[PDB]
DNA sequence: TAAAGGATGAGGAGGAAT
DNA sequence: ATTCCTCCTCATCCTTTA
């Protein structure tokens, strides 16, 4: 019966104790290829037990990205990578709101005692929520504190929608460029393409903390001095490719599988705007990626050293009121598509 | 038309008390 | 072992607005 580690540091995180540098892996789980699977920590019961059983009985490494950025992100990671000698990307991240939001400390009330944000999700707060808070707060301007029933009203709203103070009585949601930076993506990683404000939030919410993922993938730089070939499944906006690019690891080849067309364009822009030299091949529906094209691409470029992906959490995530059904759900079922591909790659890389 | 706003809880986790 | 309380959570669906 899996239980979550407290504190949620996995095998360790920078600037905190509890670090562990070696672990036992079932002989069956040992690579090649290396693989890395991400998904949400807080699931319905029996989900991580099922997932771990299908990934060779590898116990998850649970990490809260509050040890890598200002916002929380309780994630479970499963992988067959070494743990010794991890390092992190520079520059060091901004861990507290005071550091990440320095144009805000003029406007920050002292009865808002938050130093960290909640999890960046797909749905963000409204412009009218902002006005409701301001009109509830302009009466009390001369007075050093509003009444406590009113403090409780706005404070609960701020924690619900991850608001930050941007002016007098003005508590606004994050902007995309602010989510991109908290998550490790370069600013306007998602701007290109006529992308709507709403659609950028949905794609940013379904994303990696780059710092967190990169700290796990650091261990690949000294062992692949000439670069790697990546099979990136459920790619999204390229959290894993950005992790590797920030690690300064050459991506000879990236086969990416992503059903959304604007996501695929985001990664293609990032590929061209970073003047990358390797090749980017893009597939859409993973259910239509046959084993034949997999081994055909393996016979041509010489195997995949890394298989990275995060399955859909739509049916596991607690924000879902309708279809929190587990791995039985129409989208999170696609986890077994991840295993299916990794078995094909394993069959040739053994 | 395309984008934004608003309505819709369950379900555990993690404390702090016995 | 228990109970009791506060909090958080890669979201779906329908209606309104420009
Ligand atoms: N059938 C399918 N085939 C391929 N990708 C799919 C798919 N169904 C959903 N997806 C994709 O899986 C992703 C869910 S998780 C997104 C991963 C995360 N945003 C990252 O950067 O790693 C979505 O981005 C979605 O477009």
Q: Which residues of A129-147 are buried (b: 16+ CB within 10 A; e: fewer)?
A: bbeebeeebeeeeeeeebe
**CB-based contact A81:A33 (threshold 8 Å):** no
* CB burial of residue A85 (10 Å; 0-12, 13-18, 19+): exposed
Q: Which residues contact A59 (CB under 8 A, 6 or more apart)?
A: A2, A52, A78
Q: What's the Å distance between residue A261 CA and nucleotide C4 C1'?
A: 49
**CB-based contact A72:A8 (threshold 8 Å):** no
Phi, psi of A338 (to 5 degrees): -60, -50
CA proximity to A207, closest of A108, A119, A332: A119
Rounded to whole angstroms, the Cα distance separating A76 from A59 reads: 10
Rounded to whole angstroms, the Cα distance separating A109 from A143 reads: 12
- Strand, coil or helix: A51: helix
Name the experiment that determined this structure: X-ray
- Strand, coil or helix: A217: helix
Report CA A141 to chain centroid distance, whole Å. 39
Residue with tokens 């095998």: A11
Q: Who touches strand C, with Cβ under 7 Å?
A: A 38-40, 42, 72-75, 118-119, 121-123, 159-160, 205-207, 234, 310-314, 317-323, 331
What tokens does A175 get?
């902007």
Give me the domains of chain A, ranges plus CATH numbers: 27-92+186-349 (3.40.50.150), 97-175 (no CATH)
Resolution in Å equals 2.5
**CB-based contact A87:A219 (threshold 8 Å):** no
CA distances from A289 to A281, A307, A346 (A): 12, 15, 16
Rounded to whole angstroms, the Cα distance separating A251 from A227 reads: 6
Rounded to whole angstroms, the Cα distance separating A43 from A313 reads: 9
Q: Where are the alpha helices (DSSP H) in A56-102?
A: 97-100
Continuous segment of H or E residues that includes residue A170: strand A170-173
Task: Please name the residue whose C-alpha is nearest to the C1' of nucleotide B9.
Answer: A321
- For helices A239-246 and A261-273, the axis angle rounded to 10 degrees is 10
Q: List the beta bridge partners of residue A232.
A: A256, A308
Continuous segment of H or E residues that includes residue A280: strand A279-283
Residue nearest to atom 14 of ligand 1 (CA): A312
Rounded to whole angstroms, the Cα distance separating A332 from A230 reads: 22
Rounded to whole angstroms, the Cα distance separating A240 from A228 reads: 13
Chain A residues 288-327 with Cβ under 7 Å of strand B are 318-321, 324
Q: What's the Å distance between residue A43 CA and nucleotide C3 C1'?
A: 25
CA dihedral angle for residue A44, residue A45, residue A49, residue A52, rounded to 10 degrees: 10
Rounded to whole angstroms, the Cα distance separating A281 from A233 reads: 12
Strand ordering across the sheet containing A251-257: A61-64, A74-79, A34-40, A306-310, A228-233, A251-257, A279-283
Q: Would the CB of A38 count as within 6 Å of ligand 1? A: no
Rounded to whole angstroms, the Cα distance separating A181 from A336 reads: 32
Residue with tokens 């693989």: A35
């Amino acid at each position: 019966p899996i239980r979550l580690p407290n504190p949620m540091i996995g095998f360790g995180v920078p600037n905190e104790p509890g670090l562990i540098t070696h672990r036992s892996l079932p002989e069956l789980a040992r690579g090649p290829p290396f693989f890395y699977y991400e998904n949400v920590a807080l699931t319905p019961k029996g989900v991580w037990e099922t997932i771990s059983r299908h990934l060779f009985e590898i116990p998850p490494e649970f990490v809260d990205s509050k040890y890598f950025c200002v916002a929380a992100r309780k994630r479970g990671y499963i992988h067959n990578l070494p743990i010794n000698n991890r390092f992190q990307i520079q520059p060091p991240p901004k861990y507290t709101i005071h550091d990440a939001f320095p144009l805000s400390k003029r406007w920050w009330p002292e009865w808002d005692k938050r130093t960290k944000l909640n999890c960046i999700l797909t749905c963000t707060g409204s412009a009218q929520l902002t006005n409701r808070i301001r009109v509830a707060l302009e009466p009390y301007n001369e007075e050093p504190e509003p009444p406590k029933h009113v403090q409780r009203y706005v404070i609960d709203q701020c924690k619900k929608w991850n608001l930050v103070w941007v002016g007098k009585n003005k508590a606004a949601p994050l902007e995309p460029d602010e989510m991109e930076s908290i998550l490790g993506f370069p600013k306007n990683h998602t701007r290109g393409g006529g992308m709507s404000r709403t659609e950028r939030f949905k794609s940013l919410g379904n994303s990696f903390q780059v710092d967190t993922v990169a700290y796990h993938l650091s261990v690949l730089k000294p062992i692949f001095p000439h670069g790697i070939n990546v099979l990136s499944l459920f790619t999204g906006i390229g959290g894993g490719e950005v992790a590797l690019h920030r690690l300064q690891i050459k991506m000879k080849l990236v086969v990416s599988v992503e059903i959304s067309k604007v996501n695929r364009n985001i990664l293609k822009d990032f590929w061209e705007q970073t003047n990358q030299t390797g090749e980017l091949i893009e597939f859409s529906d993973i259910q239509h990626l046959t084993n034949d094209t997999i081994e055909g691409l393996m016979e041509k470029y010489g195997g995949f050293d890394l298989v990275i992906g995060g399955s859909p959490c739509n049916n596991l995530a607690g924000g879902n009121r309708v279809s929190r059904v587990g791995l039985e759900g129409d989208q999170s079922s696609l986890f077994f598509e991840y295993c299916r591909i990794l078995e094909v790659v394993r069959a040739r890389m053994r």
